[PDB]
Design a protein around this ligand. Sequence first.
Ligand SMILES: NC[C@H]1O[C@H](O[C@H]2[C@H](O)[C@@H](O[C@H]3O[C@H](CO)[C@@H](O)[C@H](N)[C@H]3O)[C@H](N)C[C@@H]2N)[C@H](O)[C@@H](O)[C@@H]1O
Ligand SMILES: Cc1ccc(-c2nn(C(C)(C)C)c3ncnc(N)c23)cc1
Ligand code: NA
Length: 263
Amino acid sequence: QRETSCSRPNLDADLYGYRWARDNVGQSGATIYRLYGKPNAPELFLKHGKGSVANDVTDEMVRLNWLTAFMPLPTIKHFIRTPDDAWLLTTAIPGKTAFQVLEEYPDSGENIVDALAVFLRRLHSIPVCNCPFNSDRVFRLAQAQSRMNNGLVDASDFDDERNGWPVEQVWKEMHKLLPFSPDSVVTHGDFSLDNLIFDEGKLIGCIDVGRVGIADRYQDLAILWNCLGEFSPSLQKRLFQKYGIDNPDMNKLQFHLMLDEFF
Ligand SMILES: NC[C@H]1O[C@H](O[C@H]2[C@H](O)[C@@H](O[C@H]3O[C@H](CO)[C@@H](O)[C@H](N)[C@H]3O)[C@H](N)C[C@@H]2N)[C@H](O)[C@@H](O)[C@@H]1O
Ligand SMILES: Cc1ccc(-c2nn(C(C)(C)C)c3ncnc(N)c23)cc1
Ligand code: NA
């Protein structure tokens, strides 16, 4: 059947009367706009990806859409995909990042880490049978290989212990840590202090979920542990203690930190 009846059925009016600011200025990836200062309307964020980055913004859109059923996330107001562009408009989660609150309230360090650990347990508790996204080490290693071969790796942003290493050395050394035992949980993928939002003293949500998928829990623990290393070894140790691991697996920890060097 081809019913063949002639019938017939955006982003412009969604943005009426907002002030525009351009955020996260010196960071890679999508251009980020903060929309604010419109009376009687919530703050919004608008991501714009061109070229390969449009795929990244598209990845984030579908992971927001899926994961919001389980966790507190920004809400998708509008998304557009054209052959070379992606625009993602979301509601802002009010508040400050974990990083911001740690700097502003140094004495709150322990409470902040406890909250991050509990939040991480909640995410990791989502049964994997719900998750349509694969983010496992095999998938991420292939992504890392392509980024290295495409010349995209930021070799000046390596951790201190790999400062000045050629990217190829990191690649080679990382492979010596394999194989290790399979563990699969729903992960965030970039669980840094920048991507967790606190408001009025409470952890109310996470952002930047474009790498969400099934992976080793150390994908999230490692990145966060690394961030806490800017502040104190005791906050790093407390993360694992609150999460409930007796003996942090230093091999998996090192593997996932090396892997994140490529991203
Ligand atoms: N290229 C884009 C990526 O840039 C950062 O990721 C990088 C980390 O920042 C680096 O680590 C440094 O910064 C940490 C705090 O972020 C510090 O604790 C750590 N001691 C520092 O060496 C790490 N070596 C590589 C990782 N790719 C962003 O987070 C990530 O979202 C973004 O996609
Ligand atoms: C100081 C600060 C605070 C928040 C954000 C932020 N970035 N982003 C993205 C980048 C995911 C759109 C957000 N998305 C939703 N809510 C947010 N609050 C943010 C950024 C910087
Ligand atoms: Na939600």
